[PDB]
Paper text:
High-resolution structures of the E096A mutant EC and provirion were generated from the same dataset, exploiting the capacity of cryoEM to separate different particles within a mixed population. Initial maps showed one class containing 2739 particles (~31%) which were likely to be native conformation ECs, with no evidence of internal density corresponding to genome. After several cycles of refinement (3D auto-refinement, post processing, CTF refinement, and Bayesian polishing) the native ECs were resolved to 2.5 Å and the genome-containing provirion resolved to 2.7 Å using the gold-standard FSC (0.143). Similar to the PV native EC structure, the VP0 cleavage boundary was modelled to the same position, where the boundary interacts with a well conserved, and putatively catalytic histidine residue at the N-terminal end of the VP2 F-strand. Along with this conserved localisation, we also observed the same unusual φ and ψ angles around this site, with the carbonyl oxygens of the P1 and P1’ residues roughly facing the same direction, toward the VP2/VP3 intra-protomer interface. Unlike the PV and HRVC native EC structures, which resolved 13 and 8 residues at the N-terminal end of the scissile boundary, respectively, the E096A EC model was resolved for 5 residues upstream of the scissile site. However, while both PV and HRVC models showed discontinuous density leading to the VP0 A1 β-sheet, our native EC map allowed all residues between the scissile site and the VP0 A1 β-sheet to be modelled. After final refinements were performed, the native EC and provirion models were compared and yielded an rmsd value of 0.220 Å, suggesting that there was minimal conformational change induced by genome packaging in the presence of the E096A mutation.
Enteroviruses (EVs) comprise a large genus of positive sense RNA viruses of the family Picornaviridae and are jointly responsible for a range of serious diseases of both domestic livestock and humans. EV virions are non-enveloped ~30 nm icosahedral particles assembled from pentameric subunits comprising three structural proteins, VP0, VP1, VP3, surrounding the ~7.5 kb genome. In enteroviruses (EVs), cleavage of the structural protein VP0 into VP4 and VP2 is initiated by the incorporation of RNA into the assembling virion and is essential for infectivity. The resulting structural proteins VP0, VP3 and VP1 assemble into protomers, five of these assemble into pentamers, twelve of which assemble into icosahedral particles in the presence of a nascent VPg-coupled genome. These transient intermediate particles have been termed provirions, comprising the full complement of structural proteins encapsidating the RNA genome.
Numbering used by the authors:
A (entry chain B), D (entry chain B): 1 to 242
B (entry chain C), F (entry chain C): 60 to 297
C (entry chain A), E (entry chain A): 12 to 45, 65 to 323
G (entry chain B), H (entry chain B): 1 to 49
I (entry chain B): 147 to 194
J (entry chain C): 60 to 75
Write the structure that this text describes.
């Protein structure tokens, strides 16, 4: 026998160990792979697809669950009123869990790159106005007024003329990668806050509805990357599957 | 990105290799737990016939159900143990029973001769038995979601359970015994772990945001429909 | 050379460096790997503007915005089955004018409290036209689809529809509500035909999957201020070159109002949603007597 | 010792593992292989040999067991009467189990390719007539008349002039391979139905027998292939061999 | 070069790529593999029409349809043992006209209730002619066979015979019927001689093997409307170059009516089946005194 | 095929490699189960002499009896166990006893010295003992069907059991002991598994459609002759 | 199986043994190493301070 | 450690197995073989006497 | 549903105010005489 | 005409 020496780690079963295993079937060739459309080669392809961001994650009842995908916009007093706020963290528990980027982010500890959040206006063609969608870099709290919010990274969105805008949340971080931002110590990895403010108003003529809705669609950019694959915690099944 | 802010040149040498399917799916996870008790009524005869289905545990099922079609080879690891955790000197015969092959009816069944069936003989004192399983499906990929019925004919409520049953996925039975004519003196639990190697996946679906209830079934609790994520008191606050 | 080329990734375009100590390639380690289809590309993005300059197929013609508003599902145009991809030795029939034409299904009304509907393909067309007759007469079926969901509203109406294409849209149940019944959806729910089926829980898409991630599937919006219609070009997506048109649905078309329909009193309350769809590159094989189901 | 690490799967005995084993006899050379005729190198060679298809698998008694290999043909009323039906599935329980293709199909889960069923007329040389042997693709039930059956793949067989015809059952399937068709969910893999109908009649003169027989001989074509070797279930020995 | 070439597949035409860590090639893995004989080919299919243009061997002559109706067993013509394939150092005798000739055995009558018979080779010819005398006088025997089963019937008679050649036709018993007796067939059943033996259970061929799969063996039909005779050219099939002609039968000739004989009253009820057979390339070695058994 | 229907061009890249004899037969199956009990009368002395014959179990026997002649090398695996399934610390001596070599008459027999016989010493806690067995037969192939007698002379009913006995196939005895002067304290069961490597087969026979009753014997139950397949009520219906 | 022989020292855990170990994460690439000042490559650099 | 997998047949002692074994004596050279008459290289030489 | 089986156009009149349904020449004969109520309905062009 | 239906080539030698 060739002189060998077993090291620490023999007879261990590492679940992520990429090892060779004994084939149960000699000379078994599988069914030839036909061309199936849509093929995915990287999960970042799914991360880059825009998915509905549930900014209005207020309602809990099953009859009003479909209202989470859109949030109201309506005529105000013209004082730069606050429309909607949400954290810019994809892996955090909250609005981003409804997105494919958020659900995939649950499977990865560390993420990096810029984020694409597209707001689609779903009012009348007569409905007009502008919104100030401000991304606050970390450190700045929730702005108490639009004057505080415009100091950060912001877009002014004429939703009357262009029905869809995309606020690119730029990758602004101390670290090269961001872990999951959490309430507590891990808020160090917060991406910041995104808030929507009425730049002018929601202006409608006679005959147009006084309340419209905006569908937020969140995605990731081509510079988005992921690290440290982990068990997801966005959903936890506590019962056994029958 | 540059259409939003003025940007500085960042040489992003950030690797995308850990988001491949061979990185996301090539990690072994629990797809089947088989009990061989001494006094229980589950498998009292020392043998068990477990139909191969990975949709029995939520983590692997949600990972693979992210996509519709999924063609892969599998590294199957079976961690046999006493359900108190002991490593007893007991020898087991795993045996892959393909569709049409005789599923054993007893511990001393004649199908255990495994003259053509792939079988593994391994003691519990040994490390967990590892085997490479190739792509089984007569289809070009496995199909976690089959929008239709396998058979023709009129579909009543009595045969509504056939909906979603694609026999390109039910690829046989994993049969485990204690090798002997007499009953074993230990209670055995065999835990099956699948690592997906050489993975190709085609049609990405929305993830699973409801609690899994039944294997190979997208059924959800109607009165317990919870949101995809956590809730907020108001939209103007965090 | 000394190993069987019997891994699951033979025939792919990815070079894999692997470690194998056995006769079979599937025994090897996962190893290393030595516009975009998923973002619902337009016809202009896919470069298919020549086939889109006039959407006239068979003996039908629809009118809409060209190129930019034509979603090619997964960036792939429907095509006839290639010689290598097909397994059936019987040669298929290609009617190509009697089956590749726009069929108009129904006129479901969008309401302010509307929840959404789904249509299963080609179940919607199994009992309609020469396409339906070829579907009943032939065991094997293969076709892409050009679905043109039409919803006209005035410029004072508001609302949006997620017109989406969900491949292998398996319907789940409420499982008795408590989740401990293991109920299964009936034939009128799994295959509702051309009339479609209204969604009971569009939030989970009647399958336990959120509608917020439905946009990873081929989709287009009918935001009423921007566009009045959605044209989705779906190819044949299956694990098989061919399949039965009667007991397997390739995909489900989801037309769900994400933003509710809203208008003041005095405008037309009847805002209907029309499903007009054309099979593309339709193939039928395995000919026998006609069977409805 | 060279540093090694045992993976999961050591001390396992995979019965289909193609591994190296210690030779019990050093330098033992076997008896030289003489030329023996008939040599088989592939089981599909056996699959392509025509074997008697037991379409008439009605009788169970040992005295009438040899009647299973042939099925009667006789003078009818000339209304396109039904002669015999059987499923075109080689691995299914029924008529095909008597064939070598059927018995070998019990050892393989998935099969693909076209099937050759040869019907040999064993009447008098004066016996004449035509039969409509129709292969129904899946989905179509058992035809209630010959008019229903001729819509499928069919041969019209003048058995008076040519004593043997071969109905090639073409590979018409949704899937690239077919598993064993079974009563229940696995009827998805049905090949379809083969039925024999009187195209005109069985016509005999005075002195010829009024009833003849047809020997169905089933085979497979050169495009036939097999997958997923498995334990056969066409025959089950429940007792121990003494 | 460093390994013994002592596997079971040395001398074959198949290149095997194998994994071996030992001195012996048989210790290696099964590995990879780096008209048609089984379908009972005709003489035209095997290209042996020149030897078949007139079936005259020795001092005998039969008449039948040529080429297409001459079944060469396993696609191989009978031949003398090659120099490498033979083990016995004694040189064999080749009479070649006194042993390679058609011998006519018996005239078994086909009935409407006839079950079938079998003939064991060369047991049928052990006590017949110079071939029989050479079989008794020599320990070693090797020959092919040209069996010409003849059954003439009028064009108003009907029926078919599976004239088949089953190599190593081991006879089983009923085992007392219940299957718990372990009875063994007597010498008159295992080796019935030129008279043959009627089959008790032709469905299982008196061996537990179905007659429906007997056609994988060399065979020909005597469907009375088409042909009145079957000519099967059987080579020498054995694990050995030579064998004893007295205690080992190379093959059994099965003549079984699959389709029963039938005719109306007035035709000849005597429809006989004649077995005429010729040894081909007959060799005898190991000469001693003549022993019958 | 094209003489029957109009056909389309199908590029059938369907592999035939899994229908080779080295794919059909190179799967280990049970060919012998040897009992070494503590109180039973089968092998009470701790040793057993099992004549090598694979025709004792229906699956392997029917697989190999598909052909008449079959020349191969064999991978012999012996899965020793307690017939309750335990893996006890017991050491066994397998020993191939070729024809003419002395078959042991006791557990402490002098033939166990294995100075020339191939023998395997393996504990039950070890994985099953695997050995490559070469082609044994003095013939050019093994012979599952020998239409004749091994010996000359007149064949009466008393010697009718010699019919079908080809001594080119009975290639000796597989002898197993518990290595010790005293009787073992465990009941042992040794299960023999043969994987056929480098397989050549020559004459295909009809398959076995009757129940196997006796080893190396085509005997069938005369009063229990069942059809090859399932039956139908009528021929015009399914 | 290739004929091997275990020597003394198998199943031992030498804490200073520089051996190969099974990676828990296939294809995990770490965070790229930015330039951090002060880098030490040898403890004798600290000894000389 | 290099990923290995034990097959059936480990810890078995096949008496006719031609395997490598650990040498009890490093660098022990035996007594040189002088020419002894009669040498046998094959048992068939004895068979022919 | 019966009508869509024939040659048809789907006309968004809100977006494009004018559409043209080209009635294709679909006839058994090379020329069509005047279609009339009675026998000469053989020369009908069809129904729109 | 071809903007409405898929057309076959018709050699219309129809006199005007
Ligand atoms: C010796 C033991 C070998 C074990 C062989 C296990 C076969 C592996 C097949 C994996 C392929 C997927 C299995 C089933 C898929 C899904 O759970 C459902 N059937 C589809 O909803
Ligand atoms: C150290 C243990 C080595 C075990 C050696 C076993 C010898 C293997 C010989 C296999 C050859 C076939 C054995 C017997 C064949 C059949 O069962 C019958 N005799 C023929 O009907």
């Amino acid at each position: 026998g060739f002189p060998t020496e077993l090291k620490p780690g023999t007879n261990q079963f590492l679940t992520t160990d990429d090892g060779v295993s004994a084939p149960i079937l000699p000379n078994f060739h599988p069914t030839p792979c036909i061309h199936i459309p849509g093929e995915v080669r990287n999960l970042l392809e799914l991360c880059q697809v825009e998915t509905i961001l549930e900014v209005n994650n207020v309602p809990t009842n099953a009859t009003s669950l479909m209202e989470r995908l859109r949030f109201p916009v309506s005529a105000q007093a013209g004082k730069g009123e606050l429309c909607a706020v949400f954290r810019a963290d994809p892996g955090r528990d909250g609005p981003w869990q409804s997105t494919m980027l958020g659900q995939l982010c649950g499977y990865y500890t560390q993420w990096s790159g810029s984020l694409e959040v597209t707001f689609m206006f779903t009012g009348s063609f007569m409905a007009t106005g502008k919104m100030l969608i401000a991304y606050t870099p970390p450190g700045g709290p929730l702005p108490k007024d639009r004057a505080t919010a415009m100091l950060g990274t912001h877009v002014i969105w004429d939703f009357g003329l262009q029905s869809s805008v995309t606020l690119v949340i730029p990758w602004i971080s101390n670290t090269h990668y961001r872990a999951h931002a959490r309430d507590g110590v891990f808020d160090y990895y917060t991406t910041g806050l995104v808030s929507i403010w009425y730049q002018t108003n929601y202006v409608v003529p006679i005959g147009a509805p006084n309340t419209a809705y905006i569908i937020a669609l969140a995605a990731a950019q081509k510079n988005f990357t992921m690290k440290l694959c982990k068990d997801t915690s966005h959903i936890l099944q506590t019962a056994s599957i029958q | 990105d540059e259409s939003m802010i003025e940007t500085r040149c960042v040489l992003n040498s950030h690797s995308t290799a850990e988001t491949t399917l061979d990185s996301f799916f090539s990690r072994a996870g629990l797809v089947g737990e088989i009990d061989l008790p001494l006094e229980g009524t589950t498998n009292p005869n020392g043998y068990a016939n477990w139909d191969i289905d990975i949709t029995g545990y939520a983590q692997m099922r949600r990972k693979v159900e992210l996509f519709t079609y999924m063609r892969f080879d599998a590294e199957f690891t079976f961690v046999a143990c006493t359900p108190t955790g002991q490593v007893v000197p007991q020898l087991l015969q795993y045996m892959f029973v393909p569709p049409g092959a005789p599923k054993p009816e007893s511990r001393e069944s004649l199908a255990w001769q495994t003259a053509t069936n792939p079988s593994v003989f391994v003691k519990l004192t040994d490390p967990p038995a590892q085997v490479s399983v190739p792509f089984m499906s007569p289809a070009s990929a496995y199909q976690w979601f089959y929008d239709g019925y396998p058979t023709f004919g009129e579909h009543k409520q009595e045969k509504d359970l056939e909906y979603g049953a694609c026999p390109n996925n039910m690829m046989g039975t994993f049969s485990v015994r204690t090798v002997g004519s007499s009953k074993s003196k230990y209670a055995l639990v065999v835990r099956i772990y699948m690592r997906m190697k050489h993975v190709r996946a085609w049609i990405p679906r929305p993830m699973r945001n409801q609690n899994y209830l039944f294997k190979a079934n997208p059924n959800y609790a109607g009165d317990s429909i919870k949101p995809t994520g956590t809730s907020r008191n108001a939209i103007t606050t965090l | 050379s000394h190993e069987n080329s019997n891994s699951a990734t033979e025939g792919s375009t990815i070079n894999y460096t692997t470690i194998n100590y056995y006769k079979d390639s599937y025994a090897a380690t996962a190893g290393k790997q030595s516009a975009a289809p998923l973002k619902s590309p337009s016809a202009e993005a896919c470069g298919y503007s020549d086939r889109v300059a006039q959407l006239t197929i068979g003996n039908s013609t629809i009118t809409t915005q060209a190129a930019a508003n034509i979603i090619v599902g997964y960036g792939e145009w429907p095509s006839y089955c290639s010689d290598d991809d097909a397994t059936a030795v019987d040669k298929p029939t290609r009617p190509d004018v009697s089956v590749n034409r726009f069929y108009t299904l129904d006129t479901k009304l969008w309401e302010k409290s509307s929840k959404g509907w789904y249509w299963k393909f080609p179940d919607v067309l199994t009992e309609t036209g020469v396409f339906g007759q070829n579907a009943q007469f032939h065991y094997l079926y293969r076709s892409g689809f050009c679905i043109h969901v039409q919803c006209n509203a005035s410029k004072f109406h508001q609302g949006a529809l997620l017109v989406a294409i969900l491949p292998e849209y398996v319907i789940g149940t409420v499982a008795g509500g408590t989740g401990t019944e293991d109920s299964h959806p009936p034939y009128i729910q799994t295959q509702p035909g051309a009339d479609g089926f209204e969604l009971q829980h569009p939030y989970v898409l009647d399958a336990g999957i959120p509608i917020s991630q439905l946009t990873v599937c081929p989709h287009q919006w009918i935001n009423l201020r921007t566009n009045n219609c959605a044209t989705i070009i779906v190819p044949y997506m299956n694990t098989l070159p061919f399949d039965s048109a009667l007991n397997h649905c390739n995909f489900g078309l989801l037309v769900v109002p994400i933003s509710p329909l809203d208008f003041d009193q005095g405008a037309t309350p009847v805002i209907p949603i029309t499903i007009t769809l054309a099979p593309m590159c339709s193939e039928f094989a395995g000919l026998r007597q006609a069977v409805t189901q």
